[PDB]
Amino acid sequence: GSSGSSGVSGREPSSRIIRVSVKTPQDCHEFFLAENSNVRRFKKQISKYLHCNADRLVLIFTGKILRDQDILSQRGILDGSTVHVVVRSHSGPSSG
């Protein structure tokens, strides 16, 4: 009928971490994650802090939306880059 899923992504800094400036609709924050971390991973990092859902998070670097199936560097996201964060919502705050 129903299902769940738990876990904590983050064991140790293996790949070269980079400083990605996360731009939020209010303030600005800086995140440090593996530069070779698929868009997804990077998102999760946000879902961790933002405390939102990575399923509603969207990666936007330079204005162009990326795909969880896309790496940062590969995309262009380098050290000291700015990425816009989003928290899509199509339902409401309550209920869920």
Side-chain angles (χ1 to χ4, degrees), residues 14-61:
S14 238
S15 336
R16 246 249 138 177
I17 312 272
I18 53 162
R19 170 170 97 184
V20 175
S21 281
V22 168
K23 222 80 100 103
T24 57
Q26 245 194 60
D27 216 13
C28 76
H29 215 91
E30 67 226 296
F31 280 63
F32 278 66
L33 69 309
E35 68 149 56
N36 57 356
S37 284
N38 34 298
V39 162
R40 222 217 205 276
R41 279 218 179 278
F42 185 16
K43 297 160 110 235
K44 277 179 186 236
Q45 239 222 140
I46 301 143
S47 74
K48 293 232 160 93
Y49 178 64
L50 268 74
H51 290 297
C52 76
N53 258 255
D55 209 315
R56 305 274 229 279
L57 288 171
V58 186
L59 237 283
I60 301 105
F61 161 80

Side-chain angles (χ1 to χ4, degrees), residues 3-18:
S3 49
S5 215
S6 257
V8 269
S9 299
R11 213 150 148 177
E12 68 193 280
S14 238
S15 336
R16 246 249 138 177
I17 312 272
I18 53 162

Side-chain angles (χ1 to χ4, degrees), residues 48-94:
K48 293 232 160 93
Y49 178 64
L50 268 74
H51 290 297
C52 76
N53 258 255
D55 209 315
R56 305 274 229 279
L57 288 171
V58 186
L59 237 283
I60 301 105
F61 161 80
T62 222
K64 271 270 147 171
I65 302 112
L66 324 150
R67 285 277 184 192
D68 26 287
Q69 77 203 252
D70 293 22
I71 284 55
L72 314 178
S73 233
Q74 276 192 48
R75 280 297 215 168
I77 283 159
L78 232 60
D79 158 85
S81 305
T82 294
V83 188
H84 282 262
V85 74
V86 156
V87 198
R88 269 166 108 200
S89 199
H90 243 65
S91 178
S94 187

